[PDB]
Design an enzyme around this catalytic site. Sequence first.
Site, PDB file in Angstrom:
ATOM      1  N   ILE B  65       0.810  -1.203   0.000  1.00 54.95           N
ATOM      2  CA  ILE B  65       0.000   0.000   0.000  1.00 54.95           C
ATOM      3  C   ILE B  65       0.849   1.261   0.000  1.00 54.95           C
ATOM      4  O   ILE B  65       1.896   1.407   0.609  1.00 54.95           O
ATOM      5  CB  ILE B  65      -1.024   0.037   1.141  1.00 54.95           C
ATOM      6  N   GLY B 121      -0.067  -5.650   1.033  1.00 49.45           N
ATOM      7  CA  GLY B 121      -1.129  -5.871   0.066  1.00 49.45           C
ATOM      8  C   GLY B 121      -0.741  -6.899  -0.969  1.00 49.45           C
ATOM      9  O   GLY B 121      -1.625  -7.589  -1.517  1.00 49.45           O
ATOM     10  N   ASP B 124      -1.860 -10.249   0.313  1.00 49.74           N
ATOM     11  CA  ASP B 124      -3.314 -10.352   0.204  1.00 49.74           C
ATOM     12  C   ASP B 124      -3.690 -10.700  -1.245  1.00 49.74           C
ATOM     13  O   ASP B 124      -4.611 -11.480  -1.515  1.00 49.74           O
ATOM     14  CB  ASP B 124      -4.085  -9.116   0.642  1.00 49.74           C
ATOM     15  N   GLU B 144       1.519  -5.674   7.588  1.00 50.77           N
ATOM     16  CA  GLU B 144       0.508  -4.799   8.152  1.00 50.77           C
ATOM     17  C   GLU B 144       0.735  -4.510   9.622  1.00 50.77           C
ATOM     18  O   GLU B 144       0.484  -3.361  10.031  1.00 50.77           O
ATOM     19  CB  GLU B 144      -0.893  -5.358   7.892  1.00 50.77           C
ATOM     20  N   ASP B 152      -6.426  -6.587   6.474  1.00 51.49           N
ATOM     21  CA  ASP B 152      -7.867  -6.710   6.338  1.00 51.49           C
ATOM     22  C   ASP B 152      -8.342  -6.962   4.907  1.00 51.49           C
ATOM     23  O   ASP B 152      -9.561  -7.065   4.763  1.00 51.49           O
ATOM     24  CB  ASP B 152      -8.599  -5.517   6.957  1.00 51.49           C
TER      25      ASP B 152
END
Lengths: 275, 275, 275, 275, 275, 275
Positions: B65, B121, B124, B144, B152
């Site tokens: 991110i 990210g 993810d 994270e 999340d």
Amino acid sequence: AYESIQVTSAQKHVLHVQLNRPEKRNAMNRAFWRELVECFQKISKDSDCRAVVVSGAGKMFTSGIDLMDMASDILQPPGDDVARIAWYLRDLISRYQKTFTVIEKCPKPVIAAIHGGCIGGGVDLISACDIRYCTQDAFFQVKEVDVGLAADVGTLQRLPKVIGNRSLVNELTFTARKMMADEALDSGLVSRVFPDKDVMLNAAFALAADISSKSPVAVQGSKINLIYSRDHSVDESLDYMATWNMSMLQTQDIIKSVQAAMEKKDSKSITFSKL
Amino acid sequence: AYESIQVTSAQKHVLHVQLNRPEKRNAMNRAFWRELVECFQKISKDSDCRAVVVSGAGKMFTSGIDLMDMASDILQPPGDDVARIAWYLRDLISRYQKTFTVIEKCPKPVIAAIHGGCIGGGVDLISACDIRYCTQDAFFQVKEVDVGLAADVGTLQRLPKVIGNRSLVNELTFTARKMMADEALDSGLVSRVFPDKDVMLNAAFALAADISSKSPVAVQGSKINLIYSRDHSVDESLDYMATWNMSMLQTQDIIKSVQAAMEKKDSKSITFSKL
Amino acid sequence: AYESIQVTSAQKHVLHVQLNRPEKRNAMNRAFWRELVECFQKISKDSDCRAVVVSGAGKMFTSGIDLMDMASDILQPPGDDVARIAWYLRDLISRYQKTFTVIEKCPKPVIAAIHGGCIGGGVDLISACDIRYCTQDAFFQVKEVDVGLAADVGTLQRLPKVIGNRSLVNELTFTARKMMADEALDSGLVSRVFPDKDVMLNAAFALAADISSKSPVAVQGSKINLIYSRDHSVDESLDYMATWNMSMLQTQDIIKSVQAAMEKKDSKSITFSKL
Amino acid sequence: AYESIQVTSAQKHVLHVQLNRPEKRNAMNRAFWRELVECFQKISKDSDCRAVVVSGAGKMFTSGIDLMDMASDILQPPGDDVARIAWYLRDLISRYQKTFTVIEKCPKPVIAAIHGGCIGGGVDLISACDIRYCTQDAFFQVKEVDVGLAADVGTLQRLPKVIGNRSLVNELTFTARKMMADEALDSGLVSRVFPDKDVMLNAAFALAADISSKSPVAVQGSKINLIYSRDHSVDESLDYMATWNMSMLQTQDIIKSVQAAMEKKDSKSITFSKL
Amino acid sequence: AYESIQVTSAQKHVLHVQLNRPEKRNAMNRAFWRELVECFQKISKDSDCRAVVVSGAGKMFTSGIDLMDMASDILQPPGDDVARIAWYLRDLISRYQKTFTVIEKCPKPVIAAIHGGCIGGGVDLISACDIRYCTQDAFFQVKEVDVGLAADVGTLQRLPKVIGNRSLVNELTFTARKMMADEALDSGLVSRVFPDKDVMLNAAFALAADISSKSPVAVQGSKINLIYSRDHSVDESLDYMATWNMSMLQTQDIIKSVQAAMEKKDSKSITFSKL
Amino acid sequence: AYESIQVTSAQKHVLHVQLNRPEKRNAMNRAFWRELVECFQKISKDSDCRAVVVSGAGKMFTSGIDLMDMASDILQPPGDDVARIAWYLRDLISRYQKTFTVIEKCPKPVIAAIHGGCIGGGVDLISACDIRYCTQDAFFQVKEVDVGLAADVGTLQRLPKVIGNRSLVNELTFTARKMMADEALDSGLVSRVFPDKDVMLNAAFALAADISSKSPVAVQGSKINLIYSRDHSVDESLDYMATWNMSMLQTQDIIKSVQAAMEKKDSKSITFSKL
Ligand SMILES: [Mg+2]
Ligand SMILES: [Mg+2]
Ligand SMILES: [Mg+2]
Ligand SMILES: [Mg+2]
Ligand SMILES: [Mg+2]
Ligand SMILES: [Mg+2]
Ligand SMILES: [Mg+2]
Ligand SMILES: [Mg+2]
């Protein structure tokens, strides 16, 4: 005072829960089942603790259940008919399951550091922990079939959900054979093996300190949602995660992390508030 | 005309989706969350595509991110009270989870081909893909917790469901430590490791071509049912599979394959209709 | 008795279920799908059996489904419209799934001992067994996509729940490629590899005898609860386990097993009652 | 500028969504399925709306699906084999279910106000609404079996979960018989019955105004959790509720209400911020 | 003993739990939330109790939560940031839910006997009881939206699972309007209405005595399985029921009940053992 | 030949299953439990039957279980310890549950037509049926607690899911009191009451004929998805419904219905093919 375990403050934010009946190789006597519940329920509410290390005093992690207490509990149950005996036994089994479920319901990460044998109730214990380290002489054994019962305090529910090889899990369960450290590492039941107990404990406490350096909101929310995510579908778990982080993202822990990044300060120098 | 990604036709039936902000190490900014949804929704309805390869342009797969876009999104939320801020945040989290859920909901197999770092990210993303390949210099990081939040957008929900070792998943998540290629292969997060990006992309596009040579009904029904089966009991999943194949077995794809078997014709010579 | 299988009493308490069409490479023809159901339903109620070994006669474990019978059943269905064809195919798929589901619903542990090829239907079969052993020359193949269909008799529902590496599961499924013994062991699909069929069978039968020396209440209750625990949350599975052991702990097998332990006698010296 | 519906602002915070093809008795044609999705998705993100009333223009609420648009959609499907036709149809059914799922996924309460017939697709619509009112001349009909298909856009999934009498639901579904207003009130499908459409719409808009006078955080969180609670166990639903209100109790809406209670001020005089 | 409740032995096997702050209209203050948990946990282990009656002293069943205590607990929370406030509120909500969940987890049937107002927290309480009776002057109100919050201690999770009419459930919840006795009976919320409190209590105690005259194994096993069956599929619930009665059918209560039937004697003439 | 029931062809497509031991008021003897399974498994595969009516010969529907057979089955079980007794009982209970689960798993609608008493196993039977009609003199009784056991063959699993009033369900279960026709209708357990048996049977068979006039694909798919929808979330059930109707909409039953509508021919004059 706990008589079967000893809890000490290892270093800032880290609690060391030590099985402490070394003359009986930390066998799990009747009172241990209550003491570990009291212990982890306290740790769950302790706002200073951020990580837990579990180990055993003496020559090995645990020899498992105290066979004479087991005999008194199970082979001398009250009840004047089989249904009333079962009523008592269901409550007993449920209570003993809580001894290890409190480890999973504790939001702090719990690290098991195993040396020597980890027998019977030892496997139910460590499979409820989050991270497992062991020594080269360690071994694991789902001993219960050798006692005449199917394990009931968590091994069958959690062991298959901490490693991938189901053929191995079934062989261990049906035969009660020992699994030594080399195979335990290969299986993934432990994620690191150390030459001796002192070196393992140093690494366990260094890991607990590193975890404790991080935001406790992020770490403990991670544990909570990893556990939720194991037991629910991915879609259900993403829905829960959005409902969880709609409050947990509103934290100064992220503000402080962003301020550190802007100032070019390492994140390990931030101080986070208690949780 | 995407701002953050680039989609090209690699070869027959195969689409290549490349993270495309190489000057910013493919950081996932605001447009990325919307564009990957648009992209995979179109791929899902594209009757010519049978397989997808995902890679990153430039020096690394992704740095994760964009921190100052994240500060804008989360640290300056609208809402005149906490409940109203949470309302906004729940919607944001839900939208950003869809960025990677669309990969899983796309019936075509999606192959992630990672070189260099794959941070935050990035994990993810790749945990929502079906098959993962990487280079010898690649590394993975569940970053994270170092930003103050529990991941999340998918890692906690999917990562523990793509590899077996839960002790390792927990260590990665709570420490945010890097896992390098050798360990990523050992854990099974990646299927294959290659010497450099070119060799990896050749093999990823060869894998995509091979999958695309198969019946698309069979391949995409297999992905849909593997996903369903992950989230439901075996008996519920078998019942769903019978309801699925009572339609899907009525295809010329099987008749063609039985006919090839009868004549002793390679199954690679058959042509299947679009889907 | 049976046309496609042969059942023999190997040794005390152990049954050997052998796929028995060696001239046809143990292809799974119409009779096989009925016969395995009849067989394991009888074994499930057989109070003298405590463990089962499954192997194949001749050159290989199994070449998989008989394609000619499959086409007759599936490419030549009754039904005067697509809905009525689907009504028939739903029932057909459901019945063929039962062929392997009876292995999981059989409370006795079932050990698959694979040599040579284990193709298509063979992976559906072994992924419903509990413990898997193979020879150095064995190979495994999720062949269904090469026939034009998504596997529907168990592989997609159980294979991802017997090994951890989902990238590998997906690659095997979408490409139908062969997985040889070394990789099968590495993945955990098999938990032991042997140089030849004779050595493998000797170990499988020894394992079955070891399992059969243990309390059958404890072993069969362990299988039942391992399966329940795979498909339910840990908390639901613990609740079920307490409702299960509130009756199953009321057995003479505990007294017998504990007494033997106190005298340092092995499980084989005990006589447990039939179950 | 919708072709099949009309949306107006009735009064503060209340939107009126009217089925609007009165010359065709509000038959649900192709554009209707897309437009109701567009409409409720916008309502869900509209921070001024707190409640919605749904009614039909003209002589009746709805005659249901447009049969010749249905023939076009289902009887002339693309696809060169049955599996490919099914692929297309699954997507169609899934899209048309979203037409009514968006009503349930909208956090604002939705009140259906039915006059005259409410046929087929009409019952799928109203069973996805929260509160149902009707006129003395209204009637309900699960008409789909009379067209050759089991209802697939919501009635079978929601109707049995809005009323208690399953014998009646089954009779309605298998016979396609009309249920008139008196019986609809008796069954609880509708809450209130009115003499004519004007009186009903006055009461529906009064109900919507009353709901809109309440805290929107409280009302919309109540709808979200009533829906969650319908689909999950009580214990799972209580856990979700705690995770929901740990954010939502942090609102000025409660502080204002406790302050009004302290001073003895009506709770109807309070003003709440948008949501 | 208790500050907010009073527990008396009404008659053999029956306990009367009375909300006991009549000067404060039985408002649910801080002590009440702790005390009801202590009370029902003790009743759950009381082998002489077979049924419970809950009523309120003074003018009305209950005015609901004490708003001043609620504001102290909820509008004045510890926590130096929103995430830490939420961490505390999650635990607070969880503990208050337990106040009523212990009524459902108590294996003895619990009969609510309501007179006058049953507001807010009162509906959460009675919807966790098994059987509900009221007086002609009683009224019920899901008052939480009027306080600015979605009800979180049970009403939303259990009220829709005790009555069939969901349109009514939604109207009651979103408007917080009062539901009087005639409508409560019509909806099925209460199954009997009485002219006054004395007549109601006489019938509640007679019902409790009738229930207590039956085998406690049969009655308490019936409650346990009714609750399990509400939250699971019929097939899962049947499986659980077989695992439950495989122990509970092994009781002298069957011989005793059957013998009495053969001699035409009533349940009250039998002496069943404690449970 | 069935000895405890009689099956006749009432009229085209309708089968009448009559409990037929009138001299014992249709008490359920041991063999009945097997006979009803054989009967409904045959009906499920019968392509000519589209609806079933169940009634009892003689003075009443059923007096329930044969108490002497119950005593032999339960009070004289084989097994040399309590665990081995439970092993037998679990299999017995599971087998007797199948007696009524076959009614639910039969895709044809089943209509119970009750006159006089419907006691004990009668309620387990009728709660597994789809539509329930009764006479004015009928009564229903969850008698099991009076026998010393919690009902285990379906009443507790299904009765609460066929009516809305849970307080009434709990009172009926815990007291074993009779519920007469007027209250049965009010509760919704029956959806129609008739003055006498002949009038009720005429109406039951007229209902079965009306159901049989409709497309069997639509009717039986409706039953299947109503049952799926009861036990799964609305979203899961809509997903299953799309997977179901992607084949079932490809039927000539819809073509014929559309052709009838275009020709202005009533749908009752269409002939549908067997299923
Ligand atoms: Mg000591
Ligand atoms: Mg390895
Ligand atoms: Mg600073
Ligand atoms: Mg043949
Ligand atoms: Mg006070
Ligand atoms: Mg006779
Ligand atoms: Mg009524
Ligand atoms: Mg014609």
